[PDB]
Symmetry: D2
Subunit: 128 residues, 4 copies
């Protein structure tokens, strides 16, 4: 069966760091971008929609505008990698990588964000 | 772009009743069952996995056993209908219909379950 | 030790209905209103504050205005009864009755609200 | 002068495996009367501490807070209900409530965030 696999289902990241979360899918021979769909989301917020080679920010939340990208290089190697830059406390939660490629599956990834008092205080009072 | 559609994104159902939650997908010529994938879940629990024109029970959460059925006859009209029988308070929450058919999409449906005191008390203690 | 008791820790109420949720506290003979503090809340929202023998609804959450009242006759019988009118889906959740009377204690009460589609839909969008 | 509990910090950030003291202040005029003081500490409706007229009372204490939690009794005479929890775990993260009756009654909320490295986070993730 078409199986999406996650080498890590748990990421522990420092506030302000960069994170690449990886979802693997089978690619035999050459990638057919025309048949590939990748959706990345966290708790029903859309981060990435890559449908036949193009991305649509349509439901792409402002939270992930400027900070989230899919690493396109990795796609031909069967790696749908979400890179988030300048990780914030609001990025903690359960991510889903949803892949359709002649077959469909999704996996969940848990992200925990560690932060110092100063970042935690700002998030606490000014809710990001 | 391939779009899954839900006529109702909210269902309010009575404890003990039967419920059909429906999601639509475009079928603009003879349904190709071989290319259709339908996945139904609620809060990470698998209810239905319809691949290669048949259903796989190897994944059902065991809270949905004998209670969950996908209505196949409708797929040719582009309706992925989940029928749940003997609705329980545990069936309340956010459902997802995930469809792959030359394109892929999903929609969320919220189910609220109304129950009398007697049923609610049992669910409360457990 | 001073013990607050709740005969029912679970209430099931209809949208638009009325509800009286009760917490019991020990009273021997004359209630001393001067020493009695009763605070009722739900998820951090103040519903009722009876201090120095009078209701103090200057801390009441706006969601409970005109809808919430402590039955002051009941206090003399050792019953802190919160009566809520025109129950909304937002009223569902965990209530706490906090009592200070020569001693202090609290208990939790769960309220579930049954509602028709029309009320559920408005709550769903708001 | 309504009886007011005050928290100098409503947010604590603690490292996994460390010890934490979280504090709630209450008005004490002259000398504390232990006989009139009740302090309850709880987190998400689990009881951690019950101090009723001068002693601990395990009337509602949850088993997780067995030999991990104490009230600093010295601090009470200064009007400080200080909860010390030892060997902080990821499950100790959340909203704490200090409930004080001393003539009047009030409660305040304190948020604890627990930072943990991958090894501790992984154990919590599976267990
Ligand atoms: C996650 O559970 C499963 N979901 C699905 O379809 C999901 C699905 C169905 C339909 C559409 C999408 C989609 C994909 C990308 C974007 C939007 C939606 C998705 C994502 N098919 C099998 C299983 C389970 N099955 C057996 C156990 C191992 C893995 C898997 C397998 O080998 O296929
Ligand atoms: C928490 O809010 C309040 N709680 C209460 O009684 C609680 C209460 C009442 C009765 C008993 C206990 C208790 C104490 C210790 C243990 C168990 C229970 C408790 C804990 N009375 C006023 C306010 C509100 N008050 C006015 C304005 C806002 C804030 C506060 C203030 O400014 O003083």
């Amino acid at each position: 069966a078409f199986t999406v696999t996650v080498p890590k289902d748990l990421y522990v990241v420092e506030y302000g760091s960069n994170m690449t979360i990886e979802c693997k899918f089978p690619v035999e021979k050459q990638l057919d971008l025309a048949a590939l769909i990748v959706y990345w989301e966290m708790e029903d917020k859309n981060i990435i929609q890559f449908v036949h080679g193009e991305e649509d920010l349509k439901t792409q939340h402002s939270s992930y505008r400027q900070r989230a990208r899919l690493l396109k290089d990795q796609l031909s190697l069967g790696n749908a990698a979400l890179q988030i830059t300048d990780v914030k406390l609001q990025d903690a939660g359960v991510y889903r990588c949803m892949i359709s490629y002649g077959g469909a599956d999704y996996k969940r990834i848990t992200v925990k964000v560690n932060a110092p008092y100063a970042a935690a205080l700002e998030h606490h009072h000014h809710h990001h």
